[model samples]
Target: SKRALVILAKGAEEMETVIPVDVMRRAGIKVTVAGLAGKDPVQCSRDVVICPDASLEDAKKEGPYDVVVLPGGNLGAQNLSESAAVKEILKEQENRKGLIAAICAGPTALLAHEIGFGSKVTTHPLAKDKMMNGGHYTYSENRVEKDGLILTSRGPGTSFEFALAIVEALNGKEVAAQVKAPLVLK
Candidate 1:
């Protein structure tokens, strides 16, 4: 089965999390909401409460998934990094199967996870310093950056492009272009 995982926490960037999810699902991938600390539901940085389908701890997960997505927000990165469980899962997933993608500060945390296993990466502007200073990272633009199993982007402005890139990575370029062309709005 095809699977896409997104980690949720208190104050997650609404678009960073939801746009990619919505787009990927529209492209035919089954997306899972992984909430940290079994909170049942999480509050977005915008104060919108979104309920997740499974807790990071109790989700009946087996083997590796197709893609693991991290959406950026101020505290979402800190919240996710605070959990040893989430960190471990990110490492394990990267090692096992599929690709890891993070946007904005989301990439900062993913970059900090000792991702030196030949994983190329990127992050938001404000979080770029943390990603580079914290560990090994190569800089790039607001557009999507892919290195090995890692993918990243800048911030909210790039959310749709980020989502379309994920679709291209998982599905194919043709499909991604199809979705993105309309989104581009020439």
Candidate 2:
């Protein structure tokens, strides 16, 4: 079975976090929702609270996972960018050529950590400047862009599409189709 690690922090987008975890579980993936701040409940950007399965420090001990997911919210992405642990995790994941997915402002952290330089990625329209600050990466307008193992998506409205893309990447198109149908996507 495939495994995933989702990092949750203060002000993270609750929709981005929940949709992926729910959809991945539907695809039969074991997903760990790790809190960057601690084990306590996190207050999202919209004020929807979530309790993580474990703290990032504890979660890192579990070894390599198939994917590392980052959800988008300006403040959350900022906190993620400032974390030494996030930088180390991203660097290791990139070194192993593992899958890393980010949505909206989440991609900004990738730029901050220099994780996927040169990959064509997409972020929320409002995040374009931050993501392209150094012009180190190619930008795409696609709702979901997958350049090698680096996957990115635009915003809340694209969360389901983003989650499905990840499902396809890890579990294959057959399973992705199976999971997509029940979601009633047009």
Candidate 3:
């Protein structure tokens, strides 16, 4: 099954993390929350507990994934970036020319890793400077920005939009727009 990697660790923004998983599943994308907290369920920024579909170590050893997604919150992104297992997975994804999407602080994770330093992207308004100062970036009025295989968006408010964009890239824009019509999205 086509899958997406969702890193669940401490401090992940609630909306940024879960909304994409929800929207992607609605669009029929196989999303596996790669619980980076090892064997334990990780807590969201809002104190929600998120269980992992697979462990970071297990996922890395298993093989390359179709897409790797990161939801941003300060601590969550920090934890994700520092994880060797997470880095290996991301590197493999890049090596295979796969897709990567990050929201809010998620983009921070990519920037710290020196991945999208000079790419068209966006993140939470608060994080814009961090993302830009850390690397070169172009902000977009559109909720999501996709340049090559890297996709990014603002914070939790843009989660569904970001997720829809990922679905559009893999599936089709028509489905995204059509499915999004009734929802409160642009």
Candidate 4:
């Protein structure tokens, strides 16, 4: 079975974080919600609280996940961007050719970590300027953009697509379809 890591940070977008975590679990992926601020309940951007499965420090010892997910909110992305811990995990994942998925402002953290440079990526429209700060990556407006091992998506509205894409990548298109159907999504 595939495994995933969702880096949970303070002020992260509630919808972006929970939706993907929920959807991916439905896809049968063992998803670990790792807290960047240690193993405490995190207060989200919308004031929702989430408990992490493990602290990032311990999660790192768990080793190579199939994908590392970044959920976005302005402050959350900022916190993720400033974390040396996150930077190390991202770089290691990239070096190992593991899939790295970021959504909304999450991709801005990618730019901060300097992961997937030169990949065509997308973020919440409001995040484009920040993510394109340098000429390191090509930008796209597609809701969900996959460039090699890097996968990115827009805002909360695109969370399902983003999670489904990760599922398809780790599982298969057939499994993605199987998971998507019961959701009654378009």
Per-model TM-score on C-alpha atoms: 0.90, 0.99, 0.90, 0.99
Candidate 4's C-alpha runs over 4 A off are: none
Residue 177's lDDT within candidate 4 is 95
Candidate that beats the other on lDDT, 3 or 4, i.e. the better one: 4
Deviation of model 3 at 60, angstroms: 2.2
- Per-residue error for 31 in candidate 1, Å, reads 0.4
Q: What would the TM-score be for candidate 1 when compared with the true structure?
A: 0.90
The alpha-carbon lDDT assigned to residue 85 of candidate 4 equals 96
For residues 65-129, what per-residue lDDT tens digits would candidate 2 score against the true structure? 99999999989999999999999999999999899999999999999899989999999999998
Q: Candidate 3 lDDT, tens digit per residue, 1-186?
A: 567777788888877887888888877777777788775788888888877787777766655667889889889988877877767777778778999999888887886776755678878888778777744676765678898998998877777878888888877888787768777765
Residue 98, model 1, lDDT: 67
Candidates sorted on lDDT, descending:
2, 4, 3, 1
Between candidates 1 and 4, the TM-score winner: 4
Task: List clash counts for every candidate, in order.
Answer: 1, 0, 0, 0
Expressed as tens digits, the lDDT of each residue in 1-186 for candidate 4 is 899999999999999999999989998999999999999999999999999999999999997999999999999999999999999999999999999999999999989989989999999999999999988899999999999999999999999999999999999999899999999887
Whole-structure CA lDDT of model 1: 0.78
Candidate 1: which stretches are off by over 4 Å?
A: 60-63, 117-119, 181-186
TM-score of 4: 0.99
* Pairs with backbone N, CA or C atoms under 3 Å apart (clashes), candidate 1: 11-45
Error of 2 at 20 (Å): 0.4
